Amino acid sequence: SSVSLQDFDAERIGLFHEDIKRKFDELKSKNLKLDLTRGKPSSEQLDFADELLALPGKGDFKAADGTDVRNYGGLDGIVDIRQIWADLLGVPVEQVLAGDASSLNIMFDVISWSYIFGNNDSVQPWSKEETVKWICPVPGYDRHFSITERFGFEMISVPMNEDGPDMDAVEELVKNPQVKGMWVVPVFSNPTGFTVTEDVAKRLSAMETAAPDFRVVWDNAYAVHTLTDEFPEVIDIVGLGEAAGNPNRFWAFTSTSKITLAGAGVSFFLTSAENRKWYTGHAGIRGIGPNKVNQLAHARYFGDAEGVRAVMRKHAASLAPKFNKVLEILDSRLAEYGVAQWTVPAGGYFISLDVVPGTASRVAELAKEAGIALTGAGSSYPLRQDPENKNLRLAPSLPPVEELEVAMDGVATCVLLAAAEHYA
Amino acid sequence: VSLQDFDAERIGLFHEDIKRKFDELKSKNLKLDLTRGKPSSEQLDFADELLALPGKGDFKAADGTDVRNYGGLDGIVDIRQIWADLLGVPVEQVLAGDASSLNIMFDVISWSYIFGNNDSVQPWSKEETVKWICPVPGYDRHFSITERFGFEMISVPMNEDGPDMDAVEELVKNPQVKGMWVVPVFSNPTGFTVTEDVAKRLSAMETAAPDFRVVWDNAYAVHTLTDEFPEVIDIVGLGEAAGNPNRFWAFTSTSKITLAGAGVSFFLTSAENRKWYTGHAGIRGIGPNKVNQLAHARYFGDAEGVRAVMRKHAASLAPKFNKVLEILDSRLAEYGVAQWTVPAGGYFISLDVVPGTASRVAELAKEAGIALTGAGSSYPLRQDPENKNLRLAPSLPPVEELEVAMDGVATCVLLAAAEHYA
Ligand SMILES: Cc1ncc(COP(=O)(O)O)c(C=O)c1O
Ligand SMILES: Cc1ncc(COP(=O)(O)O)c(C=O)c1O
């Protein structure tokens, strides 16, 4: 009685194909120009931080330790913003470095410097190895993969599961000394929405790796970025490494790009004492230090960690209805057919949609014909290669709800037409 | 009579007297510092408004870009256009970054080492040896970058008209030589300025390395002490005219214009070099801080607004330089122990003392509570082969502290000289 599309008989699927073609032609007739690709805050979210454009303000230029933020010096970032983030994340302030307005920049730099110089645990620079391998949980973040691609690292994929990366697979892979590191987005992961559990974190902390200088990039970009009233747990991953006897394993990051201003916020690097010393030793050759004025501006804007969480409540209220609309259209158009699976995230910036394998690129092509921009098939995979051609990323944050409704209704029609083509 | 011409008896008397004066200095329990090439608080106060810019509701660049959101690797048009106008170059030449030009210099060297630059046949990491030309006295933070990368640094004199071009043109015949540092206007620390003729030689010279780069770090491009602004040679244009369009990586910043560490940096280079840079920069991140760029554009308004700011800096700094020069004149000139630059701009005075004594002068000054930068600080690997050069940084302290500090330094110079000759 219930029958999925893949189980429709030959005639039934042919007739379905004719029907959904009608619907697609109706869609194309609307002459839409809509875009579901932009993983960035809306204007209304950026409005929240309007005061920050006037901070720290005339005459307000002393950090909490007396530092004149207007003059040179200090590689670590100012104590005011470091302490707020330490309090927010529940870690010792000593673990926290605060940078400029890009956490990606710091991730690039620590990889780059490991490549040139070696890290503090290296016996030689990564540039001297015949092959460098890097573990990539998928679906994941294109800008991560682009860094390791640029450096010529062989990227080895593993599944990103509901509780984190597949640890049976990771534990096996790291037995090869070619493997130097891995990427993970541990909370509301980009784009699955999945979150690393304590058990998986402990496995990452305790596993033994063949490379003596192996590093996990723990890019906690969505550390407080809830859609609900409940904030996710902040695992003190640096502390878990230390407890396991692998203190230098984790390079942890976060930022305020999706809290304040996207591209004009403050970044953070959290790591062990030996790793911090290594980083600041190199960073002090690269320059005199980060922008302390913007750090003070941010400290004044937030006040304290509760002030950060109050801002995140504002973002949640803005984003929630957008996620809800996408989810409700996916359900109302697709659920009955058994053609697609999608995440129901509790935070972060994306919904991850799996369609009939072999059809994701066709869905994106159909959507384009109908004036709806989707992120390309494979975009969440190393080298833009999804071996199942099934996954699509949806970005609800920017457009208004009315645009999301029309666009997602269109996407649903494209999913069904591509599926009908595939099965017929 | 110069000190070096005093006879044994006379130098002995001099030595005893100056040693007593040094002891009297050391008893004052001073805590002074002539090392910091930083703007003073009074200079930083000029930009107080900038701490509140661009202000609520003011977030659009001139082309309509929302500066609060992601994207754009080149910097915003407003600040790029002001600097293009200020420097007299096409706006297309100008990239605007974050608050450190050193960071960009480091990056382009690092990326040449890892990846090669756009004219490389292989990354610099693949070379057995990389050599780099270092005009001296020069900037320690430049030399620290090339030291960190393990490049062999080859010194050449920084003369009044720029680097010794006979020496440079010979050195670049060696394909191991991949580049060169220069501070081309009010050079750090000599105050010397590259002439048109030397710039044309740099632009036209044949280099053995196909991917040779000059770092033209024009940190003091508008940083006059007199209110006469120096010529801005369009060095990128000169390289283009000479048929070496990709030779120059040019830099400047607002660190000594607005806020030191919270300003805006600039990278000026050829089209092919810009494409190479932004290709790599776009992997490193999503782009620079456009809000601070807009803040700076609003603060200045236009190139004339930048020059008005530089006049404020000149009026603050000129009396400090004058006071230092007056004390050098009144304590040292008659003895023939020292020579010093008399700069028209920039942040330093370069002082040469009796050869073999610079480290002793710095040690004596430290005993007396006066911090001087160490001997060799303006040389690669901190190695001044004559042990004669010292840097003086007048900008931060008030002139009252400068007079006490410099009087003490002069006593140290004379004691070290007396020890040397006795
Ligand atoms: C996983 C992840 N990391 C990093 C970033 C970008 O961060 P930043 O602006 O600090 O470079 C993003 C985008 O928000 C992201 O999704
Ligand atoms: C020659 C030179 N270049 C660069 C700098 C530092 O510039 P930034 O703050 O833009 O890194 C200085 C200090 O003013 C300098 O003397």
Coordinates of C-alpha atoms in Angstrom, one line a residue, chain A residues 40-41 43 46-47 50-51 53-59 61 70-72 104-105 108-109 112-113 115-117 143 146-147 150-151 257 261-264 281-282 284-288 290-291 293-294, chain B residues 37-39 41 44-45 48 51-57 59 68-70 102-103 106-107 110-111 113-115 141 144-145 148-149 255 259-262 279-280 282-286 288-289 291-292:
Chain A
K40 CA 26.0 34.0 5.4
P41 CA 24.0 36.1 7.8
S43 CA 21.0 42.0 6.8
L46 CA 23.9 42.0 10.8
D47 CA 21.7 44.8 12.2
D50 CA 24.9 48.1 14.6
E51 CA 26.4 49.5 17.9
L53 CA 30.3 50.0 14.2
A54 CA 30.7 52.8 16.9
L55 CA 32.8 50.8 19.4
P56 CA 34.9 51.0 21.4
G57 CA 34.2 54.7 21.0
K58 CA 36.0 58.0 21.5
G59 CA 38.3 58.0 24.5
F61 CA 41.1 52.5 24.5
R70 CA 45.8 51.8 19.8
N71 CA 49.5 51.1 19.8
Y72 CA 51.7 48.2 18.8
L104 CA 40.2 30.3 8.4
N105 CA 43.3 32.5 8.1
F108 CA 45.7 28.1 6.9
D109 CA 48.6 29.5 8.7
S112 CA 51.2 26.3 6.1
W113 CA 53.8 26.6 8.9
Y115 CA 54.4 22.4 5.8
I116 CA 57.3 24.9 5.8
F117 CA 58.8 24.5 9.2
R143 CA 36.9 25.9 2.3
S146 CA 40.3 23.8 -0.5
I147 CA 43.2 24.5 1.9
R150 CA 46.0 23.7 -2.4
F151 CA 48.8 22.1 -0.4
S257 CA 31.8 36.0 12.1
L261 CA 30.0 40.9 11.5
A262 CA 30.9 38.4 8.9
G263 CA 34.5 39.3 7.9
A264 CA 35.0 42.0 10.6
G281 CA 56.8 32.3 17.8
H282 CA 56.0 32.2 14.1
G284 CA 55.7 37.2 15.8
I285 CA 57.8 36.9 12.7
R286 CA 54.8 37.4 10.4
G287 CA 53.9 40.7 12.2
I288 CA 53.6 42.7 15.3
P290 CA 46.5 41.3 15.8
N291 CA 44.0 44.2 15.8
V293 CA 40.9 47.8 18.8
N294 CA 38.4 45.5 17.2
Chain B
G37 CA 59.4 53.0 16.8
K38 CA 55.8 53.6 18.0
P39 CA 53.7 56.7 17.7
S41 CA 49.9 58.7 22.8
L44 CA 47.3 58.3 18.6
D45 CA 44.9 60.9 20.1
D48 CA 40.2 59.4 18.5
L51 CA 37.3 54.6 17.5
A52 CA 33.7 55.4 16.7
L53 CA 33.7 55.0 12.9
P54 CA 32.1 54.2 10.6
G55 CA 29.3 54.5 13.2
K56 CA 25.8 53.1 13.5
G57 CA 24.0 52.9 10.2
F59 CA 28.0 50.4 6.3
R68 CA 29.4 44.0 7.3
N69 CA 29.1 40.7 5.3
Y70 CA 31.4 38.3 3.7
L102 CA 54.4 43.0 7.5
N103 CA 51.8 40.1 7.4
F106 CA 55.6 37.5 5.1
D107 CA 52.8 35.9 3.1
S110 CA 56.0 32.2 2.3
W111 CA 53.9 31.5 -0.8
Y113 CA 58.7 29.4 -0.8
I114 CA 55.8 26.9 -0.8
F115 CA 54.2 27.3 -4.2
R141 CA 61.7 42.8 11.2
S144 CA 63.9 38.4 10.8
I145 CA 61.5 37.1 8.1
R148 CA 63.3 32.5 9.6
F149 CA 63.0 31.1 6.1
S255 CA 50.0 52.1 11.2
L259 CA 46.4 53.4 14.9
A260 CA 49.5 51.3 15.2
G261 CA 48.2 47.7 14.8
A262 CA 44.6 48.7 13.9
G279 CA 44.3 33.4 -5.8
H280 CA 46.3 32.3 -2.7
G282 CA 41.2 33.4 -1.3
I283 CA 42.3 30.0 -0.1
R284 CA 43.7 31.5 3.2
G285 CA 40.3 33.1 3.9
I286 CA 37.2 34.9 2.7
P288 CA 40.0 41.3 4.7
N289 CA 38.1 43.5 7.2
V291 CA 34.5 47.6 8.2
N292 CA 37.9 49.0 9.3

